[PDB]
């Protein structure tokens, strides 16, 4: 992604264990829920994970999300975007 990051006021990383790397098709195994909000100079993130029975939509029932982290940002934030991961296989040429 980047040549260098000369400046980055905040930078952090969490624990190292693994999750699904490979390109495998199937049924949606789980649901990951998140809340991302910014208040008074800070960005707060929450989460909850569950395995799931049905594919298409968000499930019935209810459960709250626990807070993961609270970070000092200060940024006057207008927008956001979602990122996705790719998979290189022997089958695929593996090019951008």
């Amino acid at each position: 992604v980047y040549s260098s990051a000369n400046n980055c006021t905040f930078e952090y990383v969490s624990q190292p264990f693994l999750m699904d790397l490979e390109g495998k098709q199937g049924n949606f195994k789980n649901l990951r829920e998140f809340v991302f909000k910014n208040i008074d100079g800070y960005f707060k993130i929450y989460s909850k994970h569950t395995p799931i029975n049905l594919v298409r939509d968000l499930p019935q029932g209810f459960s709250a999300l626990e807070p993961l982290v609270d970070l000092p940002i200060g940024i006057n934030i207008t927008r956001f975007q979602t990122l996705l991961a790719l998979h290189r296989s022997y089958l695929t040429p593996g090019d951008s």
Binding site: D40, G41, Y42, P72, G74, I75, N76
Partner: protein, 48 residues
């Protein structure tokens, strides 16, 4: 003479609690044409 400590002269709206903003686009008093240049009625954004 140390000028270095900069502060914000202008902004669209008031700052929020614990908010911070860098943007130093040249502010124009009224004629539109100046784009990213400090012209006659376009002044550098941040004072110190």
């Amino acid at each position: 003479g140390n000028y270095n400590y900069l502060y914000r002269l202008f902004r669209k709206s008031n700052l929020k609690p614990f908010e911070r903003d860098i943007s130093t686009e040249i502010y124009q008093a009224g004629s539109t044409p100046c784009n990213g240049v400090e012209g006659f009625n376009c002044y550098f954004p941040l004072q110190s």
